[PDB]
Amino acid sequence: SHMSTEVSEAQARRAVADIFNSTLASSAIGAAWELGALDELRENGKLDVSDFAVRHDLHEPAVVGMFTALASVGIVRREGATVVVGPYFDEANHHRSLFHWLNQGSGELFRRMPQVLPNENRTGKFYQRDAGAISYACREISERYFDPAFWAAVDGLGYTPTTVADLGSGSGERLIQIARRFPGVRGLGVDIADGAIAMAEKEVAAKGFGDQISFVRGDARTIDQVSARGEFAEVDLLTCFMMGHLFWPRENCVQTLRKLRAAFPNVRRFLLGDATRTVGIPDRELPVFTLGFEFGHDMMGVYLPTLDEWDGVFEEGGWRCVKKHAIDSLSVSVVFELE
Amino acid sequence: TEVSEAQARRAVADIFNSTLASSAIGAAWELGALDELRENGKLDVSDFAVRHDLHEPAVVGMFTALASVGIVRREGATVVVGPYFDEANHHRSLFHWLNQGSGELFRRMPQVLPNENRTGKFYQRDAGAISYACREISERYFDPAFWAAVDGLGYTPTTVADLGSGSGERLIQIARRFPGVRGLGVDIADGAIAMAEKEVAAKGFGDQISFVRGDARTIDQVSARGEFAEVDLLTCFMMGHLFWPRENCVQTLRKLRAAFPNVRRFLLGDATRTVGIPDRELPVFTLGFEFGHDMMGVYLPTLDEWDGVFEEGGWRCVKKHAIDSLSVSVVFELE
Ligand SMILES: Nc1ncnc2c1ncn2[C@@H]1O[C@H](CSCC[C@H](N)C(=O)O)[C@@H](O)[C@H]1O
Ligand SMILES: Nc1ncnc2c1ncn2[C@@H]1O[C@H](CSCC[C@H](N)C(=O)O)[C@@H](O)[C@H]1O
Ligand SMILES: C[C@@H](C(=O)C(=O)O)c1ccccc1
Ligand SMILES: C[C@@H](C(=O)C(=O)O)c1ccccc1
Ligand SMILES: O=C(O)[C@H](O)Cc1ccccc1
Ligand SMILES: O=C(O)[C@H](O)Cc1ccccc1
Ligand SMILES: [Ca+2]
Ligand SMILES: [Ca+2]
Ligand SMILES: [Ca+2]
Ligand SMILES: [Ca+2]
Ligand SMILES: [Fe+3]
Ligand SMILES: [Fe+3]
């Protein structure tokens, strides 16, 4: 019962006010997550704003602002000095990493819409995002949205692996969680990013897997041109989550898939997981993330393959898709079990 | 408090999408799209992208964000104004302010709230962007009350001073209305001064209107060549809250009094902090203005606070105008 074309002035005032306050609420979701407040509310159901502000050493006027923003749209409810969870808390909290990703992570790009859209401006470094904030968001995105299907695919391997290479390894939590499932297994993360190596080795060292899991720097689209080559022969499980769309355009994907095939010829299973572009979803029925993901990629000039485009690329890439998993529900996201 | 799981999905999806809508409104305003939709009721994105030399897929995204909350509707490459177009287009400059102007502040909420961080230049805003939005906010929301106040001055100014002069447009319009008038702008920012000097010169007012770099809070320290004595009309719009806290405001009001001994009327327009509006009934702007200033550590007075400060500050409020409707905003006529 949504799509009217004609409304009262009163309705339009309220609607436009809501969009405005949604913006502040949106940013506040990610911030309340990162400052601990969404967790207190999840656990205790309620909190005392002054008490919260003191405990965490926060400027209280601004802390009232954050909660009022959440409350302007029903995520929480304010009662005197108390904030309780509101009718929309669970959903918002479930998707809190997506909001963080939108604001804290990608705000700078969406803010500069008017500078970024002009063609004369689109070369070299023409936008900025917060790498550390994205990383922070993508850690929970990976867990909350991709783990079930990732683990489901690991359960369906039909063999117990021995050496697992992970493309776009970032934090290293993927490899680490593998280590624990398959006691003896060794691992080899790969990034095109320097602070991913360090953050990982530190986190690896921090959990007792230093002796096994090592890392490397290299663009995974040209993995043959990476000095770790020699060890790629012993690897019997490849993985690649939240970065496959970078392999594109199509022809560069084909190439990259082919080159990966040769560089890892002992790989039995290759688990590939990513979000895809949607098609034909109606403007007023777009779910969370979809618009953010697609629109931001369109602004960065980065290509986003639809799900069909992935499907029709694997053969030529030198791979066969033997199982496919739908993600709940990070737009249209998928896990492919390739071999 | 009780809703279905599907209502909840939809509402959270709307909040997410609104974020991108909010940002798009300011972009669309800036890039010509809203003006083009006011006139023709429609627009073609291919046509549009081309005319403006913009990356069309990003242009489609922009319009899909606005379509996603009913500001416009899409019919293939044909955008038609939506059910909320008039209201959104009306407040476009407020959305601009929120996102393009003040986006970096609200983005860094996690870094900006911890007291430890609250020293130095702990936040950032886009001066160019903000300035760009305040031009329209000034004209769209304050002008009616502003010109009503000028009509009922009870005299005709000979020399006007404008505090936080910005673009210089207020002084230009004053000169258009009163052709013999001398004009004087104080702004604390070299960039405003330079821009205003430009515009004033370009338009042919270089003789009448001139500018000095200054902090209106300590107006008593601004050299100005003795010209403050000749001023008989004082204007100050959209910066008065920076006089606060209260003891500072009383002081700044006494110093304005003294620096401008021949001012007959002092016209002061600002938005104020509201009280007791229920969370789910906040109108546009109110939350962003208040929340942002709390984040920046800047005091925002209520209207009653303003009313209660004038006497101790050396002035008598003789006329008050309500503004429609930029949160609770007002123009005071002081003497
Ligand atoms: N072409 C490329 N080659 C190697 N690494 C890349 C890359 N493009 C992006 N990356 C890296 O991939 C990571 C994206 S986030 C990775 C999430 C991780 N797979 C997880 O689910 O926990 C970042 O660390 C980024 O630096
Ligand atoms: N202490 C201070 N003294 C003088 N100007 C100040 C100030 N603090 C901020 N400003 C200026 O006040 C302006 C806010 S924008 C308002 C512009 C103008 N009053 C108008 O009606 O359109 C900016 O130009 C800023 O540089
Ligand atoms: C990492 C992020 C992404 O592509 C981006 O931030 O550009 C992403 C990828 C896939 C699913 C969710 C988020
Ligand atoms: C200039 C702006 C403001 O306070 C700010 O940008 O910080 C403002 C003041 C008063 C009414 C509307 C906007
Ligand atoms: O082509 C597809 O639809 C998927 O890429 C993989 C798949 C194919 C056939 C049977 C199962 C999975
Ligand atoms: O105190 C007030 O109410 C206003 O600040 C000024 C005013 C007072 C009386 C008559 C008109 C205006
Ligand atoms: Ca298919
Ligand atoms: Ca000074
Ligand atoms: Ca002087
Ligand atoms: Ca009063
Ligand atoms: Fe991406
Ligand atoms: Fe201000």
Same domain, A222 and A333: yes
Q: Taking CB atoms and an 8 Å cutoff, what residues of chain A touch B125?
A: none
Same domain, B210 and B305: yes
Is B92 part of any domain?
yes
Cα B233 off chain centre by: 22
Give the Cβ contact number of residue A42 at 10 Å: 13
Q: Are strands B159-163 and B182-187 parallel, antiparallel or unpaired?
A: parallel
Report the 3 state secondary structure along chain A.
CCCCCCCCHHHHHHHHHHHHHHHHHHHHHHHHHHCCHHHHHHHHCEEEHHHHHHHHCECHHHHHHHHHHHHHCCCEEEECCEEEECCCHHHHHHCHHHHHHHHHHCHHHHHCHHHHCEHHHCCCCCCCCCHHHHHHHHHHHHHHHHHHHHHHHHHCCCCCCCEEEEECCCCCHHHHHHHHHCCCCEEEEEECCHHHHHHHHHHHHCCCCCCCCECCECCHHHCCCCCCHHHHHCCCEEEEECCHHHHCCHHHHHHHHHHHHHHCCCCCEEEEEEEEECCCCCHHHCCCCHHHHHHHHHHHCCCCCEHHHHHCCHHHHCCCEEEEEECCCCCEEEEEEEC
Nearest CA to ligand 4 atom 10: B238
The neighbouring-strand residues paired with A186 are: A163
Considering every ligand atom, which ligand is closest to the CA of A276? Answer: 3
Q: Distance between the two ends of chain B, CA-based, in angstroms? A: 51
Token pair recorded at residue B291: 């929340």
d(CA A297, CA A107): 13
CB A49 within 8 A of CB A79: no
Is B37 part of any domain?
yes
Give the Cβ contact number of residue A251 at 10 Å: 10
Is B116 part of any domain?
no
| Burial state string for B110-130 with b = 16 or more CB within 10 A and e = fewer than 16 | bebbeeebbeeebbebbeebb
Give the Cβ contact number of residue A281 at 10 Å: 16
Token pair recorded at residue A190: 């790969």
Q: Do B73 and A283 touch (CB under 8 A)?
A: yes
Phi, psi of B11 (to 5 degrees): -70, -45
Token pair recorded at residue A225: 């041109």
Q: Distance between the two ends of chain A, CA-based, in angstroms? A: 46
Q: Taking CB atoms and an 8 Å cutoff, what residues of chain B touch A34?
A: 110
Length of chain A: 339
Q: How was this structure determined?
A: X-ray
CB A64 within 8 A of CB A140: no
Same domain, A36 and A82: yes
d(CA A269, CA A238): 6
Q: Taking CB atoms and an 8 Å cutoff, what residues of chain B touch A8?
A: none
Nearest Cα residue to A74 out of A1, A27, A18: A18
Report the 3 state secondary structure along chain B.
CCCCHHHHHHHHHHHHHHHHHHHHHHHHHHHCHHHHHHHHCEEEHHHHHHHHCECHHHHHHHHHHHHCCCCEEEECCEEEECCCHHHHHHCHHHHHHHHHHCHHHHHCHHHHCEHHHCCCCCCCCCHHHHHHHHHHHHHHHHHHHHHHHHHCCCCCCCEEEEECCCCCHHHHHHHHHCCCCEEEEEECCHHHHHHHHHHHHHHCCCCCEEEEECCHHHHHHCCHHHHHHHCCEEEEECCHHHHCCHHHHHHHHHHHHHHCCCCCEEEEEEEECCCCCCHHHCCCCHHHHHHHHHHHCCCCCCHHHHHHHHHHHCCCEEEEEECCCCCEEEEEEEC
Give the resolution in Å. 2.5
Token pair recorded at residue A13: 């005032």
d(CA A2, CA B292): 32
Number of domains in chain A: 2
Considering every ligand atom, which ligand is closest to the CA of A97? Answer: 3
d(CA B63, CA A68): 29
CA nearest B279 in A: which residue? A72
d(CA A225, CA B57): 33
A9 exposed, middle or buried (CB, 10 Å; 0-12, 13-18, 19+)?
Answer: exposed
Q: Taking CB atoms and an 8 Å cutoff, what residues of chain B touch A112?
A: 100
Return the CA Rg of chain B: 22
d(CA B100, CA A113): 8
In the listed set A58, A73, A106, which residue is the last one of a domain according to the structure? A106
The neighbouring-strand residues paired with B210 are: B184
CATH number, domain containing residue A35: 1.10.10.10
Same domain, A95 and A136: no
Same domain, A124 and A195: yes
Q: Do B109 and A31 touch (CB under 8 A)?
A: yes
d(CA A75, CA A89): 5
CB B248 within 8 A of CB B217: yes
Give the Cβ contact number of residue A39 at 10 Å: 13
Residue whose pair of structure tokens reads 């084909």 in the numeric block: A254
CA nearest A30 in B: which residue? B110
Q: Do B70 and A15 touch (CB under 8 A)?
A: yes
Q: Residue B100 is which amino acid? A: Q
Same domain, A191 and A235: yes
| Burial state string for B235-260 with b = 16 or more CB within 10 A and e = fewer than 16 | bbbbbbbbbbeeeebbbbbebbbebb
Q: Residue A29 is which amino acid? A: I
Cα A109 off chain centre by: 17
Same domain, A101 and A180: no
Same domain, A162 and A68: no
Nearest CA to ligand 1 atom 12: A168
Same domain, A312 and A182: yes
Of B19, B58, B83, the CB nearest to A12: B83
Probe target for ligand 1 pocket from A150, A173, A191, with the most ligand atoms within 8 Å of CB: A191
Using a 6 Å CB cutoff, which residues line ligand 2? B 134, 138, 163-164, 166, 170, 186-189, 192, 214-217, 237-239, 242
In the listed set A71, A86, A106, which residue is the last one of a domain according to the structure? A106
Is B139 part of any domain?
no
Is B318 part of any domain?
yes
Nearest Cα residue to A269 out of A178, A182, A338, A175: A338
Same domain, A128 and A170: yes
- Ligand 5 centroid from CA A164, angstroms: 23
Same domain, B68 and B163: no
Nearest Cα residue to B278 out of A73, A245, A203, A185: A73
Give the Cβ contact number of residue A14 at 10 Å: 17
B317 Cα nearest atom in ligand 6: 6
Is B147 part of any domain?
no
Integer CA distances (angstroms), B267 to A223, B78, B177, in order = 68, 46, 16
Q: Greatest CA span in chain A, whole angstroms?
A: 70
Residue whose pair of structure tokens reads 């080559």 in the numeric block: A229
In the listed set A72, A106, A140, which residue is the last one of a domain according to the structure? A106
Integer CA distances (angstroms), A60 to A66, A81, B292, in order = 10, 12, 13
Is B70 part of any domain?
yes
Angle between helix A147-155 and helix A173-181 axes, rounded to 10 deg: 40
- Ligand 2 centroid from CA B189, angstroms: 8
What domain range is B320 assigned to? Answer: 158-335
Nearest Cα residue to A265 out of A234, A244, A286: A234
Same domain, B87 and B205: no
Is B259 part of any domain?
yes
CB A75 within 8 A of CB A88: yes
Integer CA distances (angstroms), B261 to A220, A307, B73, B153, B309, in order = 73, 74, 57, 17, 19
CB B119 within 8 A of CB B297: no
Nearest Cα residue to B103 out of B134, B135, B125: B125
Using a 6 Å CB cutoff, which residues line ligand 4? B 130, 134, 137, 238, 270-271
- Ligand 9 centroid from CA B309, angstroms: 25
